């Protein structure tokens, strides 16, 4: 990424003529893959919501995406999981009973 040829500073490093190799197929280890997208969403409408999942949606419907995230952050491990688990309900609640 265009190093500067000097020892210190911002972009510093040895000038060398770069290459940019192949991508690796363990990079994409998390990707969509149509059958999973299908089998997962197929299981959702088999299974439905679990007691902590419903409770979460009645919170967004009442108390908003904030108290939702916080109580989710308590329910799962982290703030990032709570984020996209709440968002997962945003897109449940919009399509399901709001559309």
């Amino acid at each position: 990424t265009v190093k500067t040829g000097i020892a210190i500073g911002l972009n510093k490093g040895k000038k060398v003529t770069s290459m940019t190799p192949a991508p690796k197929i363990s990079y994409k280890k998390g990707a969509a893959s149509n059958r999973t997208k299908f089998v997962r969403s197929l299981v959702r409408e088999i299974a439905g919501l679990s007691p902590y999942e419903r409770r979460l949606i009645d919170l967004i419907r009442n108390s908003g995406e904030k108290r939702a995230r916080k109580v989710a952050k308590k329910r799962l491990g982290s703030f990032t999981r709570a984020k996209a688990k709440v968002e997962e309900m945003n897109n449940i609640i919009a399509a399901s009973r709001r559309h």
């Binding site: 059958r35 999973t36 089998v39 997962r40 197929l42 299981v43 088999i46 299974a47 439905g48 919501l49 679990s50 007691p51 902590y52």
Partner: protein
């Protein structure tokens, strides 16, 4: 393939359905002997990905373990010695509940070898496991090139040495800076750094 479905279906445990199964099944598992012979895997999706194969010479065993902590089994809680080691009741037990399960069925069918195990169920008192054993002397296995490594003697009772998965976990065998102590194996890695090396011409 129906397997993938089963995998993502068992991943919803508190889903309104599997709770029904978990509840009814946990009643039945508790109604048989603590160690009883599983006719088939109740998770043929998971078992097969741990190395179960449908053929002759694979066994599934179901085994119950009591849950919770390990009480230091001292009489009247009496430690005798300095107060750090005085603790009776908050004590953890470094080996997994699944580790004890594999061992107790391993001690049950000794002729077998223990391939692996998985959690099927639990409640309060007992955690319920299913162990997959491979018969090392059965010719469909012996002649099987993928699984015949198990018939070697160095794989005897691998669950009592912590060479199953639940062992290679609790033993903390893993790469990288979080594992420095237990990596190459703890007492091993220890003994070395506490070895004094002395050369012929002294360094």
């Amino acid at each position: 393939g129906a397997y993938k479905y089963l995998e993502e279906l068992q991943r919803k445990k508190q889903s309104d359905v599997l709770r029904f199964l978990q509840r009814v099944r946990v009643w039945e598992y508790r109604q048989k002997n603590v160690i009883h012979r599983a006719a088939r895997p109740t998770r043929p999706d998971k078992a097969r990905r741990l190395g179960y194969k449908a053929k002759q010479g694979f066994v599934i065993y179901r085994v119950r373990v009591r849950r919770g902590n390990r009480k230091r089994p001292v009489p009247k809680g009496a430690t005798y010695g300095k107060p750090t080691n005085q603790g009776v009741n908050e004590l953890k037990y470094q080996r997994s509940l699944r580790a004890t399960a594999e061992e107790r069925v391993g001690r049950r069918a000794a002729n077998l070898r223990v391939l692996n195990s998985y959690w099927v169920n639990q409640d309060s008192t007992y955690k319920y496991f299913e162990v997959i054993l491979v018969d090392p002397q059965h010719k469909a296995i012996r002649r099987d090139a993928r699984y015949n490594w198990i018939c070697d003697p160095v794989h005897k009772h691998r669950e009592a040495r912590g060479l199953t998965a639940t062992g290679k976990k609790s033993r903390g065998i893993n790469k990288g800076h979080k594992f420095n102590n237990t990596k190459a194996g703890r007492r091993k890695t220890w003994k070395r750094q506490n070895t004094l090396s002395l050369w012929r011409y002294r360094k």
